[model samples]
Target: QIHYSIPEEAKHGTFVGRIAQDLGLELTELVPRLFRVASKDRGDLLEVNLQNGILFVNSRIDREELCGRSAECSIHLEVIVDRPLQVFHVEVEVRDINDNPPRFPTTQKNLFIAESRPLDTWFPLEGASDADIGINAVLTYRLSPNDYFSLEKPSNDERVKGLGLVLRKSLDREETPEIILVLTVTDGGKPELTGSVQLLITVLDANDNAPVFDRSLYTVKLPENVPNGTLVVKVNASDLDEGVNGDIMYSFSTDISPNVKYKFHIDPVSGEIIVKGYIDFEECKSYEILIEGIDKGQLPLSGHCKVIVQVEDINDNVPELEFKSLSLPIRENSPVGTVIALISVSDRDTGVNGQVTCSLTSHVPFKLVSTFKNYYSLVLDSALDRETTADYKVVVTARDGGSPSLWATASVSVEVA
Candidate 1:
């Protein structure tokens, strides 16, 4: 048996080797002997050129996908001759090339390390994956320059190597709460390939510190009738401690009223206050909520803050009209000051939204006059002729002074006698 080797992913017509020359066969005898080549698999990955007695790649050869991570990857072919029925076995090995770069499952890694950790502490890091074999698959790690941390490589282990971050010095959460690092992974392939991932290291706080809010009081204004789940505000409280001790949870005080509890919600981890129930301006114009942030240490400590949420008004109520009395029929010769209807208009909204004005729509002998706040009286402004018109149709409109104002109308019919 004779063996040969070729690089994987070689394009078609790539010369593999002179098979007949190595097999001790004359070049002229290739055509006369009717030489043929066949591979073990159905699809021939290699074929022999009869004119040159040489072998060439017939199709693409993917070493990793075809043979997986196996150390040895090769194909077998049978050579035949018709003149004397001679057969020979040939072996072809597919060598690996750097085709794929190392990839991490996540681009950014978040790590929490206690500031009280001792020196030389080894923290195992997530490894990368490469779809290659042998040297091209071997990866080495490099850490960004920093004083507190260093990279550690596995020693004397043929199975596999794991990358680690070795702590070089003590950490202080108060001095340096966060540290940003970059880790680069390079393969051993020629003209090396590399990939990098960002490391976000947060120093965990010890129980020596308590949670503290940036301010003692926060205020916000929200429009009434906002949909539930609307974010009102975010209350921030940071802890000097690290790990679970530094983690802060937000909540309302136990003595908070049920009204505040029913209308607002605070996230336990994010400290975001959200609207959970319908808010009405008429119910209460403003509300006060006492918020607290507690740590997860064994002896839990907390901080307090107050949030004042003011409710803003919306144009939700329409103008209301009430009639106290109406005169159905009147003499055409009645005094011009005769009263036809006494009406009042009101709205529930406050400020400009509740202010209303009254007016008559038709141009007849009738007019509207303001009697009091939101009250109006319809009276005869001119003499009416019964022979010309037997009845009169009067439309009274009441509109509020608000953006996109709301109005109410009342129709009155008066018969002349």
Candidate 2:
């Protein structure tokens, strides 16, 4: 007896094995011996070529369609030769292929979980099955992205590689009474196949505890230059109830200033305070956020906490310059010491940072003359000729006395006619 292996779904006339040669029979003798191949059942599945003495698949073999998930599948055959009345036994094994996709028992599953469920509470979910065997049938489970729930792998305790939904975080009925999750099952194959089912999770309500913050007050000092979405602080809160009654959501109180409301944001689920808008120390020195955490009960109770954010000042202000006075279109041959433009400079910062000095750029005829504090005059230090220079762009620069020095510039267009 001998064994041959061939993958399922092989094409017709596909070479299986050199039966006559492997069986120690010459190709010339195979024709005269009246060699024939036969199987008790499904005899037409394989055929032997008399001339070449090679065995080939007679027809397409659908292993999965025929055997139907059988782990070990093979077709037993008997090779008969007429002259000597000799017979040889052969078995052709059928290998499985990744042809079928995984399927869920149901299209959708509705699950009810109590709002008071503790963390890591596992809720069993239906698993998917694949018709193909071995690696093709092996399935992996995954749950859609969600803040409150996650998928738990089937532990060694379970017979099947089943799946369960774990409550990773607290749930609130008043905030989100229903959550829709997608449970996906994928098979390990060359061209991987996947199946999914919708999980409609409905959280039941149980009204009870009032949320309490870890501390009644939180103080944080941040520079006025922090970018938006910066984490201000994470306020911790707890409640001694289950489900909606125990779920605590953080928010700014009604009495909070509109400025605070616009500049700060508190995550309802995580209680994380974040910077939502611009914070300028020059506009506002500080902000008092009255944060409130309310439970999701029939008659909810709330807890209050105060966050005092002090916006520290930084030398972010640049010197601003403006042409306060200008006498344009000067006549040709204008005399020296003529005031062409008066410029003013100011900085938002105080002390030395705000002290600015003005100067004219280039070797032009104009020069800056300090008339008063934060003021300068663009005077014609040399005579002008209309034919020589009809127009002149005199640039004035104002720089602050800060360490790194911030500056601004204004241009004066002097037209000589």
Candidate 3:
């Protein structure tokens, strides 16, 4: 029998030198082993041969044969010899394959604002998204060619992670106030893929307009005898807004004296100022009035103008009772000679036209007892008896000390008890 054994250091699936020491087979007389080496778990197999009684091994061995049906059969050497040979260590390496693609958080995005807004208002653009990190996830933003507004990454400038694109252009109120922008975000991948979003910008309105007046100042002359309903002057103003904000009204400024005897009434829609009553040049020759125009905007705007009115003299003259008639009752037994009436008078003209005096009418029963300070006290010069007459009607006259001495009358009624 020919015996066979392998060195302890010999590796699995490695060829070991074979010998027939007792059988007397010469080194040149031995035939090749003609064996195949395989894996115990059916991973891979290698073929081997023996020449001149020496084993010729494959450079590397696979103890796990990939082609075998079972682990026990995989590593078992199939040889033509009548005896078995021992095998040792084997090594194998595994390889990897590419599988995943870059992904984004969303497929589509959009942004918007109004048509009349002012400048410097900020609008947000859609944020980019990516599933992969590093080179696969790095994204860049770009604006479309037709978009008017500029786009920028605000968060990236501030060293922040995810604030999306911000507007770098200021919106104008007069020009193209509103706009729509398209943005594209791309990833730095093998065959770069892109995503896009729609952004809308709206502009809002603001009141920056000032009011205007039709004239800077107004002057007018009126006759002293102008009637109560006469128009002294007309003032006008306007605004530019297209709607109710353009609506304007007029009013007198509060700086004018309250008792000046002049009044103003304004046309609400037309902004026309009109004299509301009569004028007396004897009381005041000239008057200065301040008038203002105001718009009807949510927040009102105002402008102002001054009016100077000159009064001209007229021959229309009249005397008025400074104190009208007054009534008094006296006790029947009281002093019989007591004064019961005091009279006063006034005129519209200055100098002789305005000087006035008091007198009793020829038909009255009272006589003037004294005079002082444009007033007169009258007494019952005739003896009085309650039984004969319970009351007395005395007619007092007021006469202006002018050339014509125009006169008016007031009657005093006295009761005796």
Candidate 4:
């Protein structure tokens, strides 16, 4: 018997070994020149070239689909020379290609893991199957990125290969009850092919984790006159451990004063912060309240942060002016440095709204003394002659620092002496 190897993709009527030459026979017209080859089980799978004494493929062959993951595949046939009925046995081994990717039996898989399971424990995973043989078969396995599980090869030392899943670390169902993993398997074919399956892992509970605040430091602005019990802001926190271990509560940090706590309250479950005591702009401008998040477990873990609340100013007060000088007489010719009038200006509003300024119209023969600490004074800056003017009506206008400024005016007469 003579054997041959060919890839299954060989085209119909493609050339094979010359049967007459292999059997040490010549192709000549003197003897009978007809030749034929027959296969008993596979019909129309093979044929003989009578003119050239060559064998050819009569039909297509698909080794992977026919063999179904077998290590090797071949087809048997008998070659018959027609002149004297000489018989020859033949076998053709169909080689494989990386045509079909590895596939899981089902599209989805569900696996359950206990929280107390030890590390390095192996879990039998449903092996992926490939129709092709040799390197086209499933060689290595993969898993989605996570903290818990990993891929485990059954035997790395073997010429043949397969894979499974292993628990690399302990699991906590409370921390994460369910995880969606993407399991992938690939073959070592040139320009490799791969297939993937979805795996849902549900971890049982055994838990502990430090409490988490959504932010490091929270900052917000509120009008100081906001009513009591108004929702200012919510402080949030979470625990990886859920259920009894992960059940969370919110409150003020331990160092916060009772008076401050009395001014505000937090929801035990929701983490919302609400106002309690009165807030006044004149009393205090800003408040930083520390918060705490705790889990309701046998052993409680906590997290903390500071809530920085900025109190904004409103135009709540008008500017007022008081005279700090005597009623004075002005000479026809006044010195540039002569003080015409001095006044005190103040506002009841605090911070930005509490700043004060004084103004004079263009017709006045006076200028302002830009003094330190907002002391307002009017100076006689030259060109003031009583011969040109009998009396001057000085109107002192004071304005407070506000979006729409509040102003107060006081009048005085600078008479000739």
> Whose TM-score is greatest here?
1
Selected candidate, larger lDDT, 3 vs 4: 4
TM-score of each: 0.50, 0.48, 0.41, 0.46
Candidate 1 ranges beyond 4 A from true positions = 1-208
Task: Compose the digit string of candidate 3's lDDT tens values, residues 1-417.
Answer: 232333221245554434322234444433443233353443333344334343324333322223222222112333343224433332322111111233335444434454334444445444665544445456777876754455555553555554444444544444655566666777775557677666555444444455677787888887676655566666667665545667777777767777443555656566565667656676778788777777777787888888877877653467776543343686666564666666665567777667776676665545775467666677656566789888877776777766656778877667877
Write the number of the candidate with greater TM-score, choosing between 1 and 4. Answer: 1
- Residues 1-417, candidate 1: write the lDDT tens digits: 999999999999899999999989988899989988888873678989988888999988888877788889888889998788899999999999899888898889999998778898888789899899889998988889988899888777776556778988878888988999999999999869999999999987668677999989999999999999999999889887777888999999998989899999999988999999999998889999999899998889989999999999988899998888877788877888999889888899999989988888667788889888888888888787889999888888888888989989888888988
Q: Per-residue alpha-carbon lDDT of model 2 for 1-417, expressed as tens digits?
A: 889999888889999999998888898888888898997676588899888888889987888776887898887889988788899998999999888889998989988988778887788787887889988898888888888888777867656454677777878877887999998888987668989899898887666457888899999999876998999999999887676778888899999999889998889989999999999889999999999999887899898999998988777899998887877888776788888887888899876778898777666977778888888888888777778779888888888887778988888778987
**Model 3 stretches astray by more than 4 angstroms:** 1-121, 127-139, 142-151, 156-202, 242-244, 260-262, 317-417
What's the CA error at residue 56 for candidate 4, in Å? Answer: 1.5
lDDT of 1: 0.88
Model 3 alpha-carbon miss at residue 248, Å: 2.2
Candidate 1 displacement at residue 369 in angstroms: 0.7
